[PDB]
């Protein structure tokens, strides 16, 4: 079966993380802004601009690593500004690694082509047209890579031999690449 690529979903960019992580990111983004809101909007507080419109915006700019307008000029504000920075340092960096991890695995995926690869790939089953010249060619086989197939094709379950070629094309079409 010619392996045409499966088109991903439009929401497949976030596949390096789990979607259980992303929901916990948003719950963390909400709570960090509100904790900074209570720290900033304190009862003796001078000039503390971090409202609910600013602390929602400051944490977003800190999470996207694009800087900020202003920084918290208070020690408890610097703590929550500190731990959110070490939060968003890891989550962005962990996303970069697993997205590299998907792509490094994907290029190691090699198509089985030289028939030695077919002699080693037990995941894809392979059969022939029985009662022809192919099945007899593997019967009196003198090459070990051919010998492994005739060891397998006699011993595979169920019958990998197919009576007609039209069904022999059909077991390729039905398995969608699981069969050779």
């Amino acid at each position: 079966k010619k392996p045409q690529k499966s088109k991903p979903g439009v929401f497949s960019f976030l596949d390096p993380l789990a979607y259980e992580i992303w929901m916990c990111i948003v719950f963390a983004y909400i709570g960090v802004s509100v904790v900074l809101f209570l720290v900033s909007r304190f009862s003796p507080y001078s000039t503390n601009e971090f409202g609910i419109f600013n602390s929602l915006w400051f944490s977003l700019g800190a999470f996207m690593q694009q800087g900020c307008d202003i920084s918290p000029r208070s020690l408890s504000g610097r703590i929550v500004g500190g731990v959110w920075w070490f939060f968003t340092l890891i989550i962005i960096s962990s996303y970069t690694a697993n997205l590299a991890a998907f792509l490094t695995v994907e290029r190691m995926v090699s198509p089985i082509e030289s028939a030695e690869d077919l002699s080693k790939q037990t995941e894809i089953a392979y059969g022939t047209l029985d009662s022809g010249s192919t099945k007899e060619f593997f019967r009196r086989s003198k090459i070990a890579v051919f010998d492994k197939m005739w060891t397998y094709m006699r011993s595979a379950e169920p019958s990998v031999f197919v009576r007609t070629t039209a069904e022999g094309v059909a077991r390729v079409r039905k398995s969608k690449g699981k069969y050779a």
């Binding site: 789990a18 904790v35 020690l75 929550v80 790939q121 037990t122």
Partner: protein
């Protein structure tokens, strides 16, 4: 007599090699990498939400040194 000519050794090559193998055939291309779990990155949240509480305690001790 069977060992000096290797009939028994071929029978050793017979019975343990014909049963199907579990070697590099499933270590070779039966792996795809997963997404990250939450548990891989869980401890960052404990430092985060723990940092949320530790910010709240220093804000309360400023209330003493302000008063």
């Amino acid at each position: 007599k069977l060992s000096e000519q290797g009939v028994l050794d071929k029978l050793k090559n017979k019975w343990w090699y014909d049963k199907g193998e579990c070697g590099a055939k499933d270590s070779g291309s039966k792996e795809k990498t997963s997404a990250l779990s939450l548990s891989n990155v869980a401890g960052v949240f404990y430092i985060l939400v723990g940092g949320l509480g530790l910010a709240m305690l220093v804000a309360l001790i400023e209330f003493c040194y302000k008063s």
